[PDB]
């Protein structure tokens, strides 16, 4: 059945905009190998059909045949269940820990980048570094089930990566631009993971361009005074 994903539009009302939820679903659909289409939505000038398909304005959203699906988590669950073998590969992680590792980074980043007071930056930057180190330890330690492995759960991209990678990419782009902050080179696990991810088109190609991510954070990110 025809699959159509509706995602937020970026700065010019047309390009794909910054949104880790949209990118997560794009990655899942690409990894499944299903035929699908994508439609961008300018939250300041939505179309009639969209105004009707999704009255509440939640984005992203998905159309499966003629049925609308909302809530990124529920949409992902649905896709894993219905796009299944032998036609399409199972993307779920085997190690439960893969599904939480590094998830806390994004919130820590968000608090860190919204803060402008230098006294508080010392603490938030350290909390961000700490969360990055915990992820690094997960990536360097062998997994119970299934280190030098490429991704969170092994050598194949799973649903866990589809959630985390978009978020980490935003962290990197925004932190570098607005704070000159880079993920420590000391964190080899995190760096190898990001390099391995960037080599995969499913991630690289679904990243909005840096300026779009930067501009998405213009009224969020503050300079430290």
UniProtKB/Swiss-Prot annotation:
One of its GO terms (cellular component) is membrane. Keywords: Acetylation, Cell membrane, Chloride, Chloride channel, Cytoplasm, Disulfide bond, Endoplasmic reticulum, Glutathionylation, Ion channel, Ion transport, Membrane, Nucleus, Oxidoreductase, Phosphoprotein, Transmembrane, Transmembrane helix, Transport, Voltage-gated channel. The chain crosses the membrane at residues 21-41. It is an enzyme of class 1 (oxidoreductase). InterPro entries: CLIC, CLIC-1_C, CLIC_N, Glutathione-S-Trfase_C-like, Glutathione-S-Trfase_C_sf, Glutathione_S-Trfase, Thioredoxin-like_sf. Monomer. Homodimer (in vitro). Interacts with TRAPPC2. Dimerization requires a conformation change that leads to the exposure of a large hydrophobic surface. In vivo, this may lead to membrane insertion. Interacts with AKAP9. This is Chloride intracellular channel protein 1. It comes from Homo sapiens. The lineage of its organism: Eukaryota, Metazoa, Chordata, Craniata, Vertebrata.
């Amino acid at each position: 059945p025809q699959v159509e994903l509706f995602v937020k539009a970026g700065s010019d009302g047309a390009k794909i905009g910054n949104c880790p939820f949209s990118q997560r679903l794009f990655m899942v659909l690409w990894l499944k190998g299903v035929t699908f289409n994508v439609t961008t939505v300018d939250t300041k000038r939505r179309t009639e059909t969209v105004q009707k398909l999704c009255p509440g304005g939640e984005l992203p959203f998905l159309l499966y045949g003629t049925e609308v699906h909302t809530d990124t988590n529920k949409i992902e669950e649905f896709l894993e269940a219905v796009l299944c073998p032998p036609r399409y590969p199972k993307l779920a992680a085997l190690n439960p820990e893969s599904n939480t590792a590094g998830l806390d980074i994004f919130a820590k980043f968000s608090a860190y980048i919204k803060n402008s007071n230098p006294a508080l930056n010392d603490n938030l930057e350290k909390g961000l570094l700490k969360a990055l180190k915990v992820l690094d330890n997960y990536l360097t330690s062998p997994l119970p089930e299934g280190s030098q492995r490429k991704f969170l759960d092994g050598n194949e991209l799973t649903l866990a990566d589809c959630n985390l990678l978009p978020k980490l990419h935003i962290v990197q782009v925004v932190c570098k631009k607005y704070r000159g902050f880079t993920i420590p080179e000391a964190f080899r696990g995190v760096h190898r993971y990001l390099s391995n991810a960037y080599a995969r088109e499913e991630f690289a190609s679904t990243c909005p361009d840096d300026e779009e991510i930067e501009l998405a954070y213009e009224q969020v990110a503050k300079a430290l005074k």
